[PDB]
Paper text:
To further investigate the mode of binding of pyridomycin to InhA at the atomic level, we crystallized and solved the structures of wild-type InhA and InhA (S94A) mutant in complex with NADH as previously published. To further corroborate that the D148G mutation in inhA was indeed responsible for pyridomycin resistance, we overexpressed this allele in H37Rv and compared its effect with that of a well-characterized mutation associated with isoniazid resistance, InhA (S94A). Initial experiments determined the NADH-binding constant (Km) and confirmed that for InhA (S94A) it was around 6.5 times higher than for wild-type InhA. Enzyme inhibition studies showed that pyridomycin was able to inhibit both wild-type InhA and InhA (S94A) at a similar Ki (6.5 and 4.55 µM, respectively). Additionally, these biochemical and enzymological results confirm that InhA (D148G) is more resistant to pyridomycin while InhA (S94A) is as susceptible as the wild-type enzyme. The pyridomycin resistant strain PYR7, that carries the D148G mutation in InhA, is not cross-resistant to isoniazid and ethionamide while, conversely, the S94A variant that displays isoniazid resistance remains susceptible to pyridomycin. This suggests that, while both pharmacophores are competitive inhibitors of NADH-binding, they bind to the pocket in different ways. Data were indexed, integrated and scaled with XDS. Both wild-type InhA and its mutants crystallized in the P6222 space group with unit cell dimensions of approximately a = b = 98 Å, c = 139 Å, α = β = 90° and γ = 120°, with one molecule per asymmetric unit.
InhA (also known as FabI) is an essential component of the type II fatty acid synthase system (FasII) involved in fatty acid elongation and is required for mycolate production in M. tuberculosis. The FasII system is highly conserved in bacteria but absent from humans making it an attractive drug target. InhA is already the target of the current frontline anti-tuberculosis agent isoniazid. The combined results unambiguously indicate that pyridomycin is a competitive inhibitor of the NADH-binding site of InhA, NADH-dependent enoyl-[Acyl-Carrier-Protein] reductase, the target of the two anti-tuberculosis pro-drugs isoniazid and ethionamide.
Residue numbers in the entry:
A (entry chain A), B (entry chain A), C (entry chain A), D (entry chain A): 3 to 269
Write the structure that this text describes.
């Protein structure tokens, strides 16, 4: 397996359609031993992760909670056994209050809402790296999930701003992670039909936002030289596993696009 | 003059070495009629702006204060006279608490501090545009100040992250500003020896940060095909005035680099 | 006028719909004294340029002709008078054989054809700078015309490759031009309905290429926050004049987008 | 092995320090069956490749020779056996005449020399893809070698321009390769001490060019968060193998940086 013998922490599972669920599945298919972290609904997350190929300990982590972060490394060391360190960390965490996304006008998101979204979606990449680098092995790899924010787009609004901040944060965590012989990169994925995204396309954040996002999805597949299947997270999971492996050993502070090549084409 | 008859709001003057001071001077030399906004120390700012080529009303604006923003357009309309609108807006506002810049390790900036810095340095570009677009003329121009955040750098730390967020915000304000026939752009300047920057080079945020920043400055001039003079803000002021003019009428959501060309060269 | 007293060479006029025709017109409206260069059909070009606001000497320049280039500076000095130097140079030259554009498959352009297109469209920017820098004043400006090649697009095929080469060439000419106190930049324009482009949309290079290009044009206006009018070259002419002026004095090796902001937006 | 059962063509071996030699070695260590192509000095190349972990047929390919290209697919099919197709193609070909690199002034490279360099270094990526896609399997991968040309640099001169053209070509070959279910990407490597590069650092193209390149190398390692070892090609070989594998299945028209992260950092 691509990740035989590696110990990898995977955050961000909430449903069986989470990108992180597929990352976790693929990583286990490839020989990795996982520790999972979950937010708020631990009983649900446990029930979901029971469906993974192998059992994995689940630890609670609210990235906005200082105590959770302070205790994190000790709790992971307990789960993987003293004397063992992590080889990989997956940040698959993102949130923006609905005032910051969709039909709510861009100028009407109050800063308390965007700040919460930036905390969870961007700053937390640094928080997690701070927590976990002390328990990571040389040759290790930290990976986060990105959605290409280099051009503005309808509806995504402040979440795009949050992703712009995340990409900047990633370049700084690579500097810190380098002192540990650890890489830090993001995977920029094409749009994926997670539960939240399905609800949004169905109009959860207003009809016009739903319509624009559906339009956005169609253009993506059309632009992608090898196509893009929003219903299939596995090509993105495989990409994260590539970065977790020893096979991109000279890539750090960087962004790998798992998007069908859509960002390389105009029409 | 390049800006004859234009009415332009200029934020961000705090000392006679502020980039915004030079923007204001150059704009007045070019025939613009100004309204100034200042933060906190209004008596000082008045004394500084007395030195400008022409008199200009000074209005208080703390970009973190909802009431200041709510009243802003009415106060500007009063200063410029009912029935007149603004043609230009200059955002020259930036701040990051010292935990987010310098020798303080990147991972040790508490989120309350980075959030304050992002509020002032990035979100406020949207706040000001929201406040002022209702009183801007078609063909108008909003300009903000950027420091190229596309690669990480020593010391600047979370301020670089804030600038990454600002660039993303700018692309979204261009969408909103377009409905008014208004452009929105940033000028990415090379490093300038403002009071704060002089103190930082002199070690205000720790010796090693001062040393790295001085090194950064030297490399800039060395890379710039036409050189770079950190002691002279006027080429950056002139660039802002270019964007405020009618001479870049098809540029919006964009970034103009006033940096001697340094960002286009590797060594 | 924006360019009062400046002496500026303008290449690339072939019809009254050439972008360079509008550059020349606007520059003369702004007080510039022009020298024109034309390719092959000098009698036609003279008849076209007779319609400019002021008379201007026309010099023959085939950018593929070593002798034309060797004699160029002497011929310009003769036209503007000994002891006078140029302040500005406009490169508005581009060509790709039809095997390199349109419905002809990308893989079927023979290298002799792409090499001719790269010679005329990219290398010649360096040729002209080599010829003219010896007769340019400090504070001068060289400007070339770009079409954003950062993503691939239907039909434009090898011309896009040529533009990618041009952008790289520009960064190197900025290094050389800097020794003379001269700036070098490109204006990346949105699509403009020149004669050649009209013929192409009408199917001169095959129906499907025409269709894709028309689609490309529509998306541009739709993406542009301030819109995009392919029938109007003046906003691009104005942008070139901005770079020819003293108002972007710290920008070199760079690209200014006169495209309605379309490149900053995804949808 | 990462590439078990894959059939892969590897061009560009000339010495045992060629990047392509290490690509070939690593690919064979990972279970790939290779076909090699070599230019001009076939007897030498055979002697060098005898040192690879496994035997591999060597086919002559001068990328400037139309007949070599016309016969290429038939010769490969013969070497791998009728009914078998390629899964991978590695383009590791680059050349620029010495008038286009080093101390020879940028403006003094005659176009015949740069055209030869662009033919070999950029156009040939399209030539090879044209030749080989008809004999590639769905899920296959074409990879070329890039040196980041987004900023100008001393000495590399027209080779940087050639790399800018290559990156553009890659995005177009991805469009064509997509019709075959094939990906096309480049690996942008940090500087590597190949024979040619060692000679250049030692002054083969003039002292000042040698000095600037040595300076360039040192800055790279200094900028790279995980460091950069110019004497070790294996991290770049591993990266090429990652792209040849099934583990980046949604990446095409793209660039992966195997450069220690140096391009993500300013200082
Ligand atoms: N779905 C898509 O189209 C794309 C998603 N991404 C990114 O992939 C990552 C995973 O998201 P998806 O799988 O799409 O959605 P999801 O809703 O399945 O996953 C989001 C995760 O964020 C976690 N989270 C929220 N607040 C948290 C907190 N305070 N502490 C800890 N965890 C918290 C949630 O519990 C959830 O598990 C996110 O960064 C998302 O932005 C990137 C590109 C596309
Ligand atoms: N100095 C440099 O090397 C460069 C500076 N810039 C940017 O130029 C802009 C102007 O900064 P400088 O002239 O360098 O420094 P400065 O210290 O002269 O100006 C900063 C301004 O931000 C204002 N400000 C801070 N908090 C505020 C608040 N809550 N409400 C309203 N205003 C507030 C301050 O009053 C001050 O006038 C900033 O965005 C800065 O990031 C960009 C590139 C380089
Ligand atoms: N029309 C459009 O949609 C856009 C055009 N551009 C660029 O603007 C520049 C001007 O082109 P347009 O005005 O569109 O077309 P045009 O056909 O009016 O101008 C092209 C010029 O290139 C000149 N030329 C060709 N071969 C030459 C040679 N060997 N020596 C000297 N001159 C030669 C032609 O004589 C002609 O004057 C070109 O670089 C073009 O690529 C950039 C963006 C968009
Ligand atoms: N060495 C370095 O610092 C870096 C090299 N690269 C690229 O890696 C690739 C491989 O180069 P290196 O291993 O460095 O040098 P090398 O000299 O070992 O390999 C160059 C190959 O190009 C081949 N070639 C030249 N003309 C040819 C032709 N007409 N037909 C077929 N093949 C021809 C040569 O035979 C040689 O095998 C090139 O694209 C180079 O630009 C990219 C980044 C850095």
């Amino acid at each position: 397996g691509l990740l035989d013998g590696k110990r990898i922490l995977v955050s961000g599972i909430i449903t069986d359609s989470s990108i992180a669920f597929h990352i976790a599945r693929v990583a286990q298919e490839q020989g990795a031993q996982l520790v999972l972290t979950g937010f708020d609904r631990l009983r649900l997350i446990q029930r979901i992760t029971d469906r993974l190929p192998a059992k994995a300990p689940l630890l609670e982590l609210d990235v906005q909670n200082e105590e959770h972060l302070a205790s994190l490394a000790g709790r992971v060391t307990e789960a993987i056994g003293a004397g063992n360190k992590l080889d990989g960390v997956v940040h698959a965490i993102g949130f923006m209050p609905q005032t910051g996304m969709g039909i709510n006008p861009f100028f009407d998101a109050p800063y308390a809402d965007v700040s919460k979204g930036i905390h969870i979606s961007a700053y937390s990449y640094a928080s997690m790296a701070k927590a976990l680098l002390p328990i990571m092995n040389p040759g290790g790899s930290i990976v986060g999930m990105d959605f290409d924010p280099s051009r503005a787009m309808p509806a995504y609004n402040w979440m795009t701003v949050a992703k712009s901040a995340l990409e900047s944060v990633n370049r700084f965590v690579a500097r810190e992670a380098g002192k540990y012989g650890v890489r830090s990169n993001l995977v920029a994925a094409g749009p994926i039909r997670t539960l939240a995204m399905s609800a949004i396309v169905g109009g959860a954040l207003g009809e016009e936002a739903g319509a624009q996002i559906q339009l956005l999805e169609e253009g993506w597949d059309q632009r992608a030289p090898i196509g893009w299947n929003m219903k299939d997270a596995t090509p993105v999971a495989k990409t994260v596993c590539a970065l977790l492996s020893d096979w991109l050993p000279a890539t750090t502070g960087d962004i790998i696009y798992a998007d069908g090549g859509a960002h390389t084409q105009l029409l």
